[PDB]
Design a protein around this ligand. Structure first.
Ligand SMILES: [Ca+2]
Length: 219
């Protein structure tokens, strides 16, 4: 059901330091090649009073290129799909939590994202929009119980680095649990290299285009 070219649709509802917003978007890519693009539109609460960059990694792990010796747990979860839950802890105290549901309907992926950002300094780079994109990342993937029910799924850990407009970097420690909606064979531990680029945007970031490339590899 996962073809060499696949489209997706995404909707995010969230709040950051109490500012509520909604975003709708669409994307496409080549799931076995590790490449994908997305176009997002702020449909409620725009223009956003905070950095787009804390949202961009929440908009698609079915599009990770896996070698044949790493079981592709998230591709194998379809057509039913999978869920993921994420916490990002930023170096100045900010917190982002995310829940996500991924399904396959009428030949396209459907992504539903809920996000809450809290504990951000009012004068920090996120609330003042002083960031300018993520450095490339390596996510460490391993089997483990991430939702506390005693049963293993797939976990990921990342140290992410956000570029600052004034120079230097703003770090986040990220933990994600990925849960197939049906029993799927789990891989052993491995690593995924990821780069997410903002490829275009309008003046107030109410329309944004993104490109991501991702590939798994042995440790
Ligand atoms: Ca579990």
């Amino acid at each position: 059901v996962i073809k060499e070219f696949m489209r997706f649709k995404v909707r995010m509802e969230g709040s950051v330091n109490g500012h509520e917003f909604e975003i709708e978007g669409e994307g496409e890519g080549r799931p076995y090649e590790g490449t994908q693009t997305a176009k997002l539109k702020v449909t409620k609460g725009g223009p956003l009073p905070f950095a787009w960059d804390i949202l961009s990694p929440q908009f698609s792990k079915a599009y990770v290129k896996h070698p044949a010796d790493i079981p592709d747990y998230l591709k194998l979860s379809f057509p039913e799909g999978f869920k993921w839950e994420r916490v990002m802890n930023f170096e100045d105290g900010g917190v982002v939590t995310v829940t996500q549901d991924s399904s396959l309907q009428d030949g396209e992926f459907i992504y539903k994202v809920k996000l809450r950002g809290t504990n951000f300094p009012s004068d920090g780079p996120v609330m003042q929009k002083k960031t300018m994109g993520w450095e490339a990342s390596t996510e460490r993937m391993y089997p483990g119980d991430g939702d506390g029910d005693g049963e293993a799924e797939l976990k990921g850990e990342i140290k992410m680095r956000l570029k600052l407009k004034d120079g230097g970097h703003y770090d986040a420690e990220v933990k994600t649990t990925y849960m197939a909606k049906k029993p799927v064979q789990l891989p052993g531990a491995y690593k995924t290299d990821i780069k997410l680029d903002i490829t275009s945007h309008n003046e107030d970031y109410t329309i944004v285009e993104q490109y991501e490339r991702a590939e798994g590899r042995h440790s």
